Scaffold this active site. Structure first.
Site, PDB file in Angstrom:
ATOM      1  N   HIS A 109      42.781  15.685  26.974  1.00 29.45           N
ATOM      2  CA  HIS A 109      42.250  16.460  25.862  1.00 29.45           C
ATOM      3  C   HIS A 109      41.176  17.460  26.309  1.00 29.45           C
ATOM      4  O   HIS A 109      41.236  18.633  25.946  1.00 29.45           O
ATOM      5  CB  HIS A 109      41.665  15.500  24.845  1.00 29.45           C
ATOM      6  CG  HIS A 109      42.682  14.823  23.972  1.00 29.45           C
ATOM      7  ND1 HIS A 109      42.348  13.809  23.094  1.00 29.45           N
ATOM      8  CD2 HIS A 109      44.013  15.021  23.828  1.00 29.45           C
ATOM      9  CE1 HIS A 109      43.429  13.441  22.422  1.00 29.45           C
ATOM     10  NE2 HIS A 109      44.456  14.148  22.867  1.00 29.45           N
ATOM     11  N   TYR A 122      40.361  17.864  15.420  1.00 29.68           N
ATOM     12  CA  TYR A 122      40.665  16.547  14.878  1.00 29.68           C
ATOM     13  C   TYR A 122      41.004  16.553  13.374  1.00 29.68           C
ATOM     14  O   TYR A 122      41.913  15.813  12.978  1.00 29.68           O
ATOM     15  CB  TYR A 122      39.622  15.475  15.274  1.00 29.68           C
ATOM     16  CG  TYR A 122      39.780  15.008  16.691  1.00 29.68           C
ATOM     17  CD1 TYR A 122      39.251  15.733  17.738  1.00 29.68           C
ATOM     18  CD2 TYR A 122      40.512  13.865  16.988  1.00 29.68           C
ATOM     19  CE1 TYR A 122      39.441  15.347  19.034  1.00 29.68           C
ATOM     20  CE2 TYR A 122      40.705  13.475  18.284  1.00 29.68           C
ATOM     21  CZ  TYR A 122      40.162  14.207  19.297  1.00 29.68           C
ATOM     22  OH  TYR A 122      40.337  13.795  20.602  1.00 29.68           O
ATOM     23  N   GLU A 135      34.955  12.340  24.320  1.00 31.01           N
ATOM     24  CA  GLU A 135      35.224  13.679  24.778  1.00 31.01           C
ATOM     25  C   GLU A 135      33.959  14.552  24.801  1.00 31.01           C
ATOM     26  O   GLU A 135      33.761  15.345  25.716  1.00 31.01           O
ATOM     27  CB  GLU A 135      36.374  14.281  23.958  1.00 31.01           C
ATOM     28  CG  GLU A 135      37.694  13.604  24.353  1.00 31.01           C
ATOM     29  CD  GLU A 135      38.831  13.758  23.360  1.00 31.01           C
ATOM     30  OE1 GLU A 135      38.783  14.682  22.512  1.00 31.01           O
ATOM     31  OE2 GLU A 135      39.806  12.971  23.450  1.00 31.01           O
TER      32      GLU A 135
HETATM   33  C1  HEM Z   1      43.042  10.456  17.391  1.00 34.80           C
HETATM   34  C2  HEM Z   1      43.874  11.467  17.560  1.00 34.80           C
HETATM   35  C3  HEM Z   1      44.663  11.661  18.862  1.00 34.80           C
HETATM   36  C4  HEM Z   1      45.337  10.763  19.600  1.00 34.80           C
HETATM   37  C5  HEM Z   1      45.519   9.278  19.312  1.00 34.80           C
HETATM   38  C6  HEM Z   1      45.939  11.459  20.680  1.00 34.80           C
HETATM   39  C7  HEM Z   1      46.675  10.882  21.680  1.00 34.80           C
HETATM   40  C8  HEM Z   1      47.196  11.565  22.768  1.00 34.80           C
HETATM   41  C9  HEM Z   1      47.896  10.930  23.867  1.00 34.80           C
HETATM   42  C10 HEM Z   1      48.183   9.432  24.049  1.00 34.80           C
HETATM   43  C11 HEM Z   1      48.231  11.924  24.710  1.00 34.80           C
HETATM   44  C12 HEM Z   1      48.991  11.775  26.051  1.00 34.80           C
HETATM   45  C13 HEM Z   1      48.117  12.173  27.243  1.00 34.80           C
HETATM   46  C14 HEM Z   1      47.374  11.086  27.951  1.00 34.80           C
HETATM   47  O1  HEM Z   1      47.697   9.884  27.760  1.00 34.80           O
HETATM   48  O2  HEM Z   1      46.469  11.450  28.782  1.00 34.80           O
HETATM   49  C15 HEM Z   1      47.759  13.170  24.186  1.00 34.80           C
HETATM   50  C16 HEM Z   1      47.956  14.393  24.707  1.00 34.80           C
HETATM   51  C17 HEM Z   1      47.623  15.597  24.198  1.00 34.80           C
HETATM   52  N1  HEM Z   1      46.902  15.753  23.028  1.00 34.80           N
HETATM   53 FE1  HEM Z   1      46.248  14.269  21.801  1.00 34.80          FE
HETATM   54  N2  HEM Z   1      45.603  12.786  20.585  1.00 34.80           N
HETATM   55  C18 HEM Z   1      44.825  12.940  19.458  1.00 34.80           C
HETATM   56  C19 HEM Z   1      44.272  14.104  19.021  1.00 34.80           C
HETATM   57  C20 HEM Z   1      44.496  15.364  19.521  1.00 34.80           C
HETATM   58  C21 HEM Z   1      43.963  16.606  19.083  1.00 34.80           C
HETATM   59  C22 HEM Z   1      42.892  16.755  17.990  1.00 34.80           C
HETATM   60  C23 HEM Z   1      44.498  17.558  19.818  1.00 34.80           C
HETATM   61  C24 HEM Z   1      44.210  19.045  19.695  1.00 34.80           C
HETATM   62  C25 HEM Z   1      45.215  19.882  19.410  1.00 34.80           C
HETATM   63  C26 HEM Z   1      45.432  16.978  20.750  1.00 34.80           C
HETATM   64  C27 HEM Z   1      46.117  17.697  21.713  1.00 34.80           C
HETATM   65  C28 HEM Z   1      46.773  17.098  22.770  1.00 34.80           C
HETATM   66  C29 HEM Z   1      47.435  17.846  23.769  1.00 34.80           C
HETATM   67  C30 HEM Z   1      47.516  19.354  23.857  1.00 34.80           C
HETATM   68  C31 HEM Z   1      48.013  16.863  24.724  1.00 34.80           C
HETATM   69  C32 HEM Z   1      48.852  17.123  25.963  1.00 34.80           C
HETATM   70  C33 HEM Z   1      50.304  16.786  25.638  1.00 34.80           C
HETATM   71  C34 HEM Z   1      51.290  17.287  26.651  1.00 34.80           C
HETATM   72  O3  HEM Z   1      51.038  17.072  27.867  1.00 34.80           O
HETATM   73  O4  HEM Z   1      52.302  17.854  26.223  1.00 34.80           O
HETATM   74  N3  HEM Z   1      45.394  15.615  20.549  1.00 34.80           N
HETATM   75  N4  HEM Z   1      47.128  12.944  22.981  1.00 34.80           N
HETATM   76  C1  LIG Z   2      47.973  14.508  20.803  1.00 34.30           C
HETATM   77  N1  LIG Z   2      48.997  14.608  20.299  1.00 34.30           N
END
Ligand code: HEM
Ligand SMILES: [C-]#N
Length: 139
Positions: free
Chosen positions: A83, A93, A133
């Site tokens: 993130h 968020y 974060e």
């Molecule tokens: C509580 C809310 C959220 C959860 C539970 C969540 C969970 C995750 C998880 C499990 C991943 C996979 C990457 C990893 O394990 O290192 C991820 C990737 C990512 N998240 Fe979130 N996230 C949340 C909120 C957000 C928000 C607010 C954004 C902003 C737009 C976001 C944008 C991304 C992006 C851009 C990726 C990379 C995905 C990729 O590689 O295609 N997420 N998130």
């Molecule tokens: C983070 N989807």
């Protein structure tokens, strides 16, 4: 407090069974309503189902630990790296929450108590991620 916790736990199996379907709907909504965030994500990871599954699993992780989010710290610590590296900000968020709650309404068609319980839980889960974060951005 207790009834809401149990509702979130009751949703664990639902997410085990169709969580990917919920997150597929979440990404559809978010990419449609907030296209500006799409390039942050890897579309290959959307097409393969890997990111939908990853999000579903993270939601499961939070629901399992909803009474004490500290018990998912070692998990969230790692997600925070992705993130922060991609410029996820505190202000994104509420976008995720709006799209996730809509996805829940669309696919689970829950009662109001369940919707309320997820609105509350999401706020708490989001705060846990935001705070970790924030430290990364400032530390
Ligand atoms: C509580 C809310 C959220 C959860 C539970 C969540 C969970 C995750 C998880 C499990 C991943 C996979 C990457 C990893 O394990 O290192 C991820 C990737 C990512 N998240 Fe979130 N996230 C949340 C909120 C957000 C928000 C607010 C954004 C902003 C737009 C976001 C944008 C991304 C992006 C851009 C990726 C990379 C995905 C990729 O590689 O295609 N997420 N998130
Ligand atoms: C983070 N989807």
């Amino acid at each position: 407090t207790k009834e809401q916790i149990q509702i979130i736990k009751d949703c664990v199996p639902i997410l085990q069974k169709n969580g990917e379907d919920l997150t597929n709907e979440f990404y559809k909504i978010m990419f449609n309503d907030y296209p500006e965030v799409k390039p942050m994500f890897n579309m290959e990871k959307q097409i393969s189902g890997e990111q939908p599954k990853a999000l579903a699993m993270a939601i499961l992780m939070a629901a399992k630990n909803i009474e004490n989010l500290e018990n998912m710290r070692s998990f969230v610590d790692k997600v925070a790296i992705t993130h922060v590296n991609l410029g996820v900000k505190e202000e994104h968020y509420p976008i995720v929450g709006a799209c996730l709650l809509k996805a829940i309404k669309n696919l689970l068609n829950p009662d109001e108590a369940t919707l309320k319980a997820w609105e509350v839980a999401y706020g708490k889960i989001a705060k846990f991620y935001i705070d970790i974060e924030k430290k990364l951005y400032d530390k």
